[PDB]
């Protein structure tokens, strides 16, 4: 149902928990990296430009 | 938490860092031990690496504390029996 | 429609007393930039204050010259006198002398006092006398103003005056969140001062200036509703309309089941009567004077 | 790509712009001069650095 | 849908009186193939509610006692214990010792103080840090106290550190502290390593408050 | 002792847009108050747009009605662009009935005692037969900003349009030099707005200044 309390639960489980981002033709070992997520209203993955 | 550079400055292998911090986080999470540094509601992984950066935890101190707190349990059992 | 989200500053995370970092949250979407820009232009462009305007040496006629027994050029001592921070009483101008024949640095405590002049940092170094047969002397003038006035616009030398207390101000509008609000703006101000005022009171005076520049601009409802407005079918209301009662308040005026002493109510009509209570709206045995209670007043 | 264009536009010099040849008491009032329009961004200037 | 008055009771010739729960309507069922494993599911739900009520009554029978238990789960600032007859108790971390940390597989004993209003029944909340907690702990070792032979008044002790307590006795060659201690602190060692390393102490109560 | 801005001249050069004028201003405050009031006027002003439409013989908004040469979706867009003023209510329900060959203009709405259409030549749709008539109910309410349909209908006959509660279109300030009052280095702020007729310009500049001075209440005395 996505009630009003589970977003606080989700901000308390994301906080210090890395994820692995992966581009689909992985050529060398920098093609898999690990970030700490930030919740975004939207439907895309915002990814740092220098990376 | 951003970098883990000094946690490798104090444990030079960068692979033993993962074993020592995993052993430490497993002692803090399920075993119910208190953190030796005051947290800021960080997760147990960052508290483990934060104890590594202070220097008060590595593999030597973890073996010392596991041997002493196993000898304490068996000593309590022996003094309860005899 | 007018009541927005109104913020309050959540923390003033400050470094030493002439530098601060003041945040603001929550602001309505797009207002972080307009308050950051308004406060930035007011602080950085037009503040009241006092600083050095012109310094005439007793023996120098020229911008790029030298004095016997001085480390720096006169260009670098005008750089040093730009950094001086003087707070003055309501005297518009006041002039100061710096007669000294010493050995070593010339600190700000070696400047004459003359009453109303108050120096914030005696640690500040104007120049260095390299000998003992040399002496520094100047007519250093401070003059109250309202901004930043360079020397290329105004035996006399000129100093870029810096009237305003601020030195660095910047804002960084990051995104914040409320419970079911989608995206907002959270303002973050970073600021130094020269020392004549702490940063929090600088924000308070900027907001006071911008606010002073805008002072020339700025009964039960279902019971009063008809019985024909009820959710049930119209025969249920028509049983009440048999006594010419069209509003449920008048039906309430005779006690809960008063309609039971009339054959105009039938078998299904009583079921409709008990049903038609919905959320305790009608037929609870009410009594009024004629129509109106207190909230049913004429206005 | 965008950030090297921003840095290549930020530090160059043209021979005559707003605020030419004036002397400055540090990079702080250099930013305070650029943000108020009293000095153009690439115009050569003596500053004091530490 | 549950409202009558006397004026509506006038159609029943005033047979209804004030305040009765006179039923005048009926209901049916909700079905078939279908709706009956959801009915099985709701039958289970109703059985669960009945079981919760029964558990509440069971915990009310005792209403807090010096019972033991074994840890099974480890929650955040809470310890889950499992007793007999399918019974579970929750140990608060605020009512626990600071250094003394418990884990699963260990057996602890204390006095509960929650069997009335808790949450969907009666969450057995014990308190292994209160004085009355070790009131019968010494009584479990030396039976003299249990048979009214060791006058034990107050138990001013701090569980998790030192536990010094004085006790009186009817002058009859009993020696209260002696019985509490035993052969070379035989029973004293029991409480010493009972709930945790505590500095338990016994004082030979003399007479009145001056000697206390 | 800063000179304070006072409104001096409101040149209503056309029916939609006007040119309010602020004078005097010390140097620097021209661009500050200009950008600030522009951003408040474009951001959040109380408009009076439309929310729900219920055409009579129409189930869903993707259908077609017998006798009107536009779809029901195009009728919803043309009603979304309706420029209407309300006076003493939160929401209001307007009623439309029209029968006969020709256009259904916006002046064919049975107006209530406070609703006022500001552009009565606005076409909605075109009826195209002798006995083929539309009969709809329109729901118009107050609001602020842009409230789409996806965020916020109970029967199947309601139709939800998007809600652009925003009266202004284009706010352009042009600072310029000021004459006597016997002092130079003073400025004039001339704001040409672009309203759709639902908001008076002095009321717009007054609400914008009230919103901004409410925002500075967090750290003013």
Curated annotation (Swiss-Prot), chain A:
Disulfide bonds: none annotated. Co-administration of salinamide and rifampicin or salinamide and myxopyronin suppresses the emergence of resistance to both antibiotics. Acetylated on several lysine residues in the presence of glucose. The RNAP catalytic core consists of 2 alpha, 1 beta, 1 beta' and 1 omega subunit. When a sigma factor is associated with the core the holoenzyme is formed, which can initiate transcription. The rRNA transcription and antitermination complex (rrnTAC) consists of RNAP, NusA, NusB, NusE (rpsJ), NusG, SubB, ribosomal protein S4, DNA and precursor rRNA; S4 is more flexible than other subunits. DNA-dependent RNA polymerase (RNAP) catalyzes the transcription of DNA into RNA using the four ribonucleoside triphosphates as substrates. Belongs to the RNA polymerase beta' chain family. This is DNA-directed RNA polymerase subunit beta'. It comes from Escherichia coli (strain K12). The chain holds residues 403 to 453 of 1407 of the full protein.
From Swiss-Prot, chain B:
It holds the Pfam family RNA_pol_Rpb6. Its EC number is 2.7.7.6. The keyword Transferase applies. It comes from the Bacteria. Gene3D superfamilies: 3.90.940.10. It catalyses: RNA(n) + a ribonucleoside 5'-triphosphate = RNA(n+1) + diphosphate. The RNAP catalytic core consists of 2 alpha, 1 beta, 1 beta' and 1 omega subunit. When a sigma factor is associated with the core the holoenzyme is formed, which can initiate transcription. The rRNA transcription and antitermination complex (rrnTAC) consists of RNAP, NusA, NusB, NusE (rpsJ), NusG, SubB, ribosomal protein S4, DNA and precursor rRNA; S4 is more flexible than other subunits. InterPro entries: DNA-dir_RNA_pol_omega, Pol_omega/Rpo6/RPB6, RPB6/omega-like_sf. GO terms for cellular component: cytosol; cytosolic DNA-directed RNA polymerase complex; RNA polymerase complex; transcription elongation factor complex. Keywords: DNA-directed RNA polymerase, Nucleotidyltransferase, Transcription, Transferase. It comes from Escherichia coli (strain K12). One of its GO terms (biological process) is protein-containing complex assembly. SMART domains: RNA_pol_Rpb6 (SM01409). Promotes RNA polymerase (RNAP) assembly. Latches the N- and C-terminal regions of the beta' subunit thereby facilitating its interaction with the beta and alpha subunits. GO terms for molecular function: bacterial-type RNA polymerase core enzyme binding; DNA binding; DNA-directed RNA polymerase activity. This is DNA-directed RNA polymerase subunit omega. The keyword Transmembrane helix does not apply. It is an enzyme of class 2 (transferase). Signal peptide: none annotated. Belongs to the RNA polymerase subunit omega family.
From Swiss-Prot, chain F:
GO terms for cellular component: cytoplasm; cytosol; cytosolic DNA-directed RNA polymerase complex; membrane; transcription elongation factor complex. Residues 1-221 are annotated as: Alpha N-terminal domain (alpha-NTD). The lineage of its organism: Bacteria, Pseudomonadati, Pseudomonadota, Gammaproteobacteria, Enterobacterales. Changing residue 39 to C: In rpoA112; temperature-sensitive, blocks RNA polymerase assembly. It catalyses: RNA(n) + a ribonucleoside 5'-triphosphate = RNA(n+1) + diphosphate. Belongs to the RNA polymerase alpha chain family. DNA-dependent RNA polymerase (RNAP) catalyzes the transcription of DNA into RNA using the four ribonucleoside triphosphates as substrates. This subunit plays an important role in subunit assembly since its dimerization is the first step in the sequential assembly of subunits to form the holoenzyme. Part of the processive rRNA transcription and antitermination complex (rrnTAC). The complex forms an RNA-chaperone ring around the RNA exit tunnel of RNAP. It supports rapid transcription and antitermination of rRNA operons, cotranscriptional rRNA folding, and annealing of distal rRNA regions to allow correct ribosome biogenesis. It is an enzyme of class 2 (transferase). (Microbial infection) ADP-ribosylated on both alpha subunits by the phage T4 protein ModA. ADP-ribosylated on only one of the alpha subunits by the phage T4 protein Alt. Transmembrane segments: none annotated. One of its GO terms (biological process) is response to heat. The N-terminal domain is essential for RNAP assembly and basal transcription, whereas the C-terminal domain is involved in interaction with transcriptional regulators (such as CRP) and with upstream promoter elements. Changing residue 153 to K: 5-fold decrease in CRP-class II promoter-dependent transcription. Its EC number is 2.7.7.6. This is DNA-directed RNA polymerase subunit alpha. Keywords: Acetylation, ADP-ribosylation, DNA-directed RNA polymerase, Nucleotidyltransferase, Transcription, Transferase. The gene is rpoA. The keyword Ribosomal protein does not apply.
